[PDB]
Amino acid sequence: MELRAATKLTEEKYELKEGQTLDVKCDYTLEKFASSQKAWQIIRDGEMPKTLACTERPSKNSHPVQVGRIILEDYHDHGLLRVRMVNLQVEDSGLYQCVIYQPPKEPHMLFDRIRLVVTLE
Amino acid sequence: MELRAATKLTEEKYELKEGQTLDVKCDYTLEKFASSQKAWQIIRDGEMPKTLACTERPSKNSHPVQVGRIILEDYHDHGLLRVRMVNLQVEDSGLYQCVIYQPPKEPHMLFDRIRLVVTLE
Ligand SMILES: N[C@@H](CCC(=O)N[C@@H](CS)C(=O)NCC(=O)O)C(=O)O
C-alpha cells in the first residue's frame, strides 16, 4: 500500500534579541476547538515534540498557564491560543509549534512551526 | 506573530485481519531524502509519536532494519521507504506514519498517515 507525501510544514523564522519577549498568536478560529486541549511545544528531530506548556482538558477561557518563562492562554472569545516566552535566552533558539489535541479518527488541523532565532545585543 | 491551523493531515482508515501482514510504501521519491534518517511511528494524542523503528543516520540502501514484528527497508533505488508489520494483532491498531528526519530551516515534508484497524477472525 502507498502512503503519499502530500503535506509540508514550514518554519516561519522569528527573530528577537536576548531579554526580549516572544509573542505568538495561534488562530484556530474554529470554535469547534475551543474546549480542545492545546499546548506549546519545542520540536525535536524526527517530528518528536516536547510539551512545554499545555492548557487544561477541557480548555476554559481566560485561564492563563504559567510554566517558567512561558505564558500560555486560550482566548475562546477570539478563538486563538496566545503563547509567550519572556526574557528569551539565546539557548531558546529552536523549532516551536502550537498544538490542538484532536482525536485519531479525524483529520488533524496543523499549525506551521516557528523557527525562533534569538540573537545577542 | 500569528499563524493558523491551515494544513490537514488525514488518517487513511485501513482494515486488516489479525494474523495478516501490513505492507506499506512511503514515497519520498526525491534523491534529496535518500540518505536522511527515517522511521515508523505510532502517534499519540498531541501529535506525539512513539518511534517503533528507525533507519541508520545516514540511511544506507537495502539495509533492512528489524525490531520485533516491524521490518523497515529504505530502497534508495526506488525513492521509497517500505514498512512491514508481520502477524498483526488487535493491539497494533492505531495511527501510524512514516517520518523523514529533516533539518529545521527547510519546510518539513509529511507523509499521509494510516489509521490501522486490526479486527478479529
Ligand atoms: N506535557 C507532558 C506531555 C503529556 C501531556 O499532555 N501532559 C500534561 C501537559 S503539560 C497533561 O496533563 N496532559 C494530559 C493529556 O492531554 O493527556 C509532560 O511533560 O508530562
UniProtKB/Swiss-Prot annotation, chains A, B:
Disulfide partners: C26-C98
Post-translational modification: Glycosylated.
GO cellular component assignments: cell surface; extracellular region; extracellular space; plasma membrane
UniProt-listed GO biological process terms: adaptive immune response; humoral immune response; immune response; innate immune response; intracellular signal transduction; neutrophil chemotaxis; neutrophil-mediated killing of gram-negative bacterium
Keywords associated with the record: Adaptive immunity, Cell membrane, Disulfide bond, Glycoprotein, Immunity, Immunoglobulin domain, Innate immunity, Membrane, Receptor, Secreted, Signal, Transmembrane, Transmembrane helix
The keyword Transmembrane appears for this protein: yes
Tagged with keyword Magnesium: no
Tissue expr: Mostly expressed by immune cells of the myeloid lineage, such as monocytes, macrophages, neutrophils and dendritic cells. Expression is associated with a mature stage of myeloid development. Highly expressed in adult liver, lung and spleen than in corresponding fetal tissue. Also expressed in the lymph node, placenta, spinal cord and heart tissues. Isoform 2 was detected in the lung, liver and mature monocytes.
Induction per the UniProt record: Up-regulated by bacteria, fungi and bacterial lipopolysaccharides (LPS).
Domain Ig-like V-type as annotated: residue spans: 11-119
Spans within the Extracellular topological domain: 6-119
GO molecular function terms noted in the UniProt entry: receptor decoy activity; scaffold protein binding; signaling receptor activity; transmembrane signaling receptor activity
Subunit structure: Monomer. Homomultimer; when activated. Interacts with TYROBP/DAP12. Interacts with TLR4.
Name of the molecule in the record: Triggering receptor expressed on myeloid cells 1
Upper taxonomic lineage: Eukaryota, Metazoa, Chordata, Craniata, Vertebrata
Residues of the full protein shown: 17 to 134 of 234
